[PDB]
Amino acid sequence: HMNPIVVVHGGGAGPISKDRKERVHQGMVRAATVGYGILREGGSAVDAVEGAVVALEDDPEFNAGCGSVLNTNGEVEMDASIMDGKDLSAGAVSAVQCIANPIKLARLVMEKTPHCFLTDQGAAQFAAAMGVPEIPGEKLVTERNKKRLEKEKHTVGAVALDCKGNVAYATSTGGIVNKMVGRVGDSPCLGAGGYADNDIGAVSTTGHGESILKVNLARLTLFHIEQGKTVEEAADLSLGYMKSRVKGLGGLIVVSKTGDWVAKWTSTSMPWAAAKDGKLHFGIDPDDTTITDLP
Amino acid sequence: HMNPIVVVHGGGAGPISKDRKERVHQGMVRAATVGYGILREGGSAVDAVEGAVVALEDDPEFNAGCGSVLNTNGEVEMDASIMDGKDLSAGAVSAVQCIANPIKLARLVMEKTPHCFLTDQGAAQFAAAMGVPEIPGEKLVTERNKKRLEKEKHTVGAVALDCKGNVAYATSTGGIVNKMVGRVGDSPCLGAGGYADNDIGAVSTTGHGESILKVNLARLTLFHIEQGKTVEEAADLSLGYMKSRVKGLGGLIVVSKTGDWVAKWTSTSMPWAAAKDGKLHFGIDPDDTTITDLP
Ligand SMILES: *C(=O)C[C@H](N)C(=O)O
Ligand SMILES: *C(=O)C[C@H](N)C(=O)O
Ligand code: NA
Ligand code: NA
């Protein structure tokens, strides 16, 4: 029975306000520890990614759930997906509004429908058929987020390997600032925002959405690891393709079936946190990595 | 320069009856003809793939545009996507209602917006903006799918290689009969419903949209070519893999950057036709082909 691991990332974009970093740091730790706390009790790779991502949605410092950036009409529309490595089972929602937790709805899509993908009104209905609390829009909308939209008007993920050596991903996002209404990114789209397969590993992505879809970044990262490259080599290879081919930046986290993991980005920043052997690893900027004890 | 080629399909389905056999032949013949004429007139692969899919969207005999399957409510909900392998520019739309040509709306998302995928409410807002008319959903409803939905309770695509060397795909569908409101299959997801790359090939797929999405079928088929599998071996393994791993069945059409092409399927039947070197190739059944001359 293998040594478990969760990795966590928190949108990969431009440089961040130095004070806000403490708040971002503590958010990464929290998701990781929750994710790890779920593995600790021999809990599944699927159980774990979902719990980590639930925490970040609820954390307003991150652009998924509460903290979601705004669309062109000042509102919050959100995307998500989850995948089970074992039989490649999956669930996703795109363009949902006025619920708290997108990643759980995707899991509701995954295990409680014969389908994999619901969108907009059909998913607003499905959430209501599943007893999902509608929350006020003012709660999901923060102040910093109204500010970013004005200045333009002038993503989070988790991967995990459980004790049985199954793998899973979860990705969740409010989208991209000043996006059109109905705009779908790479997040809810299997093989682009994430992919998990026990025979390879699992990956969650963040970056220029369109560019992530265009190249299918998550499956591609995996294409390589099957070919024999390292996690770090494969992450290098795919992110560079996304830059060299479609002129797009982004970030990724992967853990393979051997339990080897890395977090790599061609964006300016990508806060990340991995937990493995009771030791938490954290970072926001390239080549500055801390390690602390997990209680 | 490259001799151009178009391959078309609807839909990797079950047994086809004698009366349907012939209309279906005529529809395929017409769509392959529209595409090849565009390529013979100097048009791009994208023009040619958009060309042929509109022909099957317009034709009531095919599950896409008019004649699409009806959802759970007795309403037509449509997905389509288009991709050029030159720069990986793409457009896609999900759960689109009350419109003739979802693929035409998919092209405009690629061409007129900074996005590559739109859905439902947002899909329609952008539609109305671009002047796409609104037609009563009823006018897409056929007594065939009407009957089929009452009973159930109790897909189209093309690949092209052009005289400039450009490849492309387009895919549109009404989905699976009686789908949940806002279910979204493969057909608008890049990598699943199709993929185009000027440096490898182009692929358009069909059948069970849930399975196609998990194995990332279209892009799976292209990794197999990248490893120097002929277009036939590449279809057979990637279809071979969906079958065993998720127990999915469907079919595809694929074209290499050099002009090699194939239609395989694992369902019982798949309408397909192909025009290259002045001839038409057509089928429904395994090796039922008739190769004629084309004026
Ligand atoms: C998150 O980083 C952005 C996401 N990839 C998207 O929705 O485009
Ligand atoms: C058409 O049968 C295939 C399509 N992939 C779907 O939505 O089921
Ligand atoms: Na959040
Ligand atoms: Na049709």
Pocket test for ligand 2, best of B71, B155, B211 (most atoms within 8 A of CB): B155
| Contact list, B214 vs chain A (CB under 8 Å) | 88-90, 116, 190
State chain A's maximal CA–CA distance in angstroms: 56
Residue A261, amino acid:
W
Rounded Cα distance, A55 and B285, in Å: 52
Q: Among all residues of chain A, which has the CA nearest to that of B223?
A: A223
The rounded distance, in Å, linking the Cα atoms of A135 and B282 is 54
Strand bridging mode B78-84 / B5-10 = unpaired
Q: How many CA atoms lie within 13 A of A255 on its CB side?
A: 28
Query: DSSP 3-state assignment of B276?
Result: strand
DSSP character for A156? E
Length of chain A: 295
- Measured in Å, residue A157 CA sits from the centre of ligand 2 at 29
Alpha helices in chain B (DSSP H): 18-40, 45-58, 102-112, 120-130, 143-153, 209-215, 217-226, 231-245
β-pair partners for A167: A161
Distances from the Cα of A132 to the Cα of A108, A112, A157, angstroms: 10, 14, 22
* Cβ atoms of A215 and B216 closer than 8 Å: no
Q: How would you label A32-48 residue by residue, b for 16+ Cβ within 10 Å and e otherwise?
A: bbbbbbbbeeebbbbbb
Contacts 24+ apart (CB under 8 A), B232-238: B232/B262, B232/B264, B235/B262, B235/B264, B236/B264
* Set of chain B residues whose Cβ sits within 8 Å of the Cβ of A115: 179-180, 183, 210
Cα separation, B96 vs B79, whole angstroms: 6
Which of B113, B120, B192 has the CB atom closest to A120's CB atom?
A: B120
For residue A147, what are the contacts with CB-CB under 8 A and spacing of at least 6?
none
Q: Do B180 and A126 touch (CB under 8 A)?
A: yes
Pick from A222, A211, A224, A209: nearest CA to A88: A222
Backbone angles phi, psi at B94, to 5 degrees: -125, 150
How many CB atoms within 10 Å of residue A137?
12
Q: Token pair of A99, please? A: 């619920």
* Dihedral sign of CA atoms B191, B193, B197, B203 in order: positive
Rounded distance, CA B248 to CA A201, Å? 22
Report the C-alpha gap between A30 and A32 in whole angstroms: 5
Max CA distance (Å), chain B: 55
The verdict on a CB contact (< 8 Å) between B95 and A180 is: no
Pairwise CA distance, residues A201 & A217, whole Å: 14
The one-letter amino acid at A269: S
Q: For chain A, first and last CA: distance in Å?
A: 22
Technique behind the model: X-ray
Strand order in the sheet with A261-265: A194-197, A201-207, A250-256, A261-265
User: Using alpha carbons only, what angle is made at residue A189 by residues A94 and A106, rounded to the nearest 5 degrees?
Assistant: 50
Which residue's alpha carbon is nearest to atom 4 within ligand 1?
Answer: A209
Residues of chain B contacting A119 with CB distance shorter than 8 Å: 94-95, 119-120, 182, 184
Ligand 3 center–CA A33 separation, angstroms = 17
Q: Write the burial class of residue B243 (CB in 10 Å: 0-12 exposed, 13-18 middle, 19+ buried).
A: middle
Beta strands B261-265 and B250-256, pairing class: antiparallel
- Quick check: A68 and A97 in contact, CB under 8 A? no
Note whether A204 and A171 are within 8 A (CB). Answer: yes
Nearest-CA neighbor of B160 among B234, B55, B84?
Answer: B84
d(CA B101, CA B106) in angstroms, rounded, equals: 9
* Total residue count of chain B as it appears in this document: 295
Distances (CA, A) of A270 to A129, A191, A243, A282, B28: 36, 20, 16, 10, 49
Q: Decide if A294 contacts A278 (C-beta within 8 A).
A: yes
The DSSP bridge partners found for residue A274 are A7, A281
Q: Which of B122, B189, B214 lies at the smallest CB-CB distance from A189?
A: B189
- Residues B49 and B161 sit within 8 Å (Cβ to Cβ): no
Q: Which amino acid is at B117?
A: F
Tokens of A293: 């004890």
From ligand 2's centre to the CA of A42, what distance in Å?
38
Stated as kind and residue range, the H or E segment containing A201 is strand A201-207
Given resolution (angstroms): 2.0
Q: Does B199 touch chain A (CB under 8 A)?
A: no
CA atoms within 13 A on the CB side of B20: 14
Residues B225, B202 contacting (CB under 8 angstroms):
no
Q: Residue A118 and residue B183: Cβ atoms within 8 Å?
A: yes
As a whole number of angstroms, the distance between CA B209 and CA B278 comes to 34
DSSP state of A181: T
Mark residue B42 as left, alpha or beta (left: phi above 0; alpha: psi -120 to 50; beta: remaining): left
What is the rounded CA–CA span in Å between residue B225 and residue B200?
7
- Ligand 2 contacts (CB < 6 A) are B 11, 155, 173, 175-176, 185-187, 206-209, 212
Tokens found for residue A114: 């014969």
Domain residue ranges of chain A, discontinuous segments joined by + = 1-295
Q: Under DSSP, is residue A239 helix (H, G, I), strand (E, B) or coil?
A: helix
B213/A126 Cβ within 8 A: no
Strand-pair category, A89-96 with A117-119: parallel
Taking the CA of residue B210 as reference, the ligand 2 atom at the shortest distance is 8
Distance from CA of A23 to the nearest CA of B (A): 31
Within 13 Å, how many C-alpha atoms sit on residue B240's CB side?
7
Chain A residue numbers touching B123 (CB-CB < 8 A): 182
User: What is the atom index within ligand 2 of the atom nearest the CA of B212?
Assistant: 5
Q: 3-class DSSP state for residue A266? A: coil
Q: Whole-angstrom Cα distance, residue B250 to residue B267?
A: 5
Instruction: Name which of B235, B196, B200, B205 is nearest B44 in CA terms.
Output: B196
Give the per-residue SS3 of A112-130: HCCCCEEEHHHHHHHHHHC
Residue in B123, B184, B245 closest to A182 by CB = B123
Rounded distance, CA A54 to CA A48, Å? Answer: 10
Q: What token pair was written down for B20?
A: 């349907």
Which residue matches tokens 């609390």?
Answer: A133
Residue numbers in the known binding site of A for substrate are: 183-186, 206-209
User: What residues of B act catalytically?
Assistant: 155
CA distance A251 to B259: 36
Measured CA to CA, the distance from residue A272 to residue A285 in angstroms comes to: 9
Euclidean distance between CA atoms B142 and B148, whole angstroms? 10
Secondary-structure percent of chain B, ordered helix, strand, coil, rounded to 5? 35, 25, 40
Contact status, residue B26 vs residue B273, Cβ threshold 8 Å: no
B250 burial type by CB count under 10 A (0-12 exposed, 13-18 middle, 19+ buried): buried
B186 is in an annotated binding site: yes
**Of B101, B78, B115, B91, nearest to B209 (Cα)?**
B78
From the list A33, A72, A142, A155, the catalytic residue is: A155
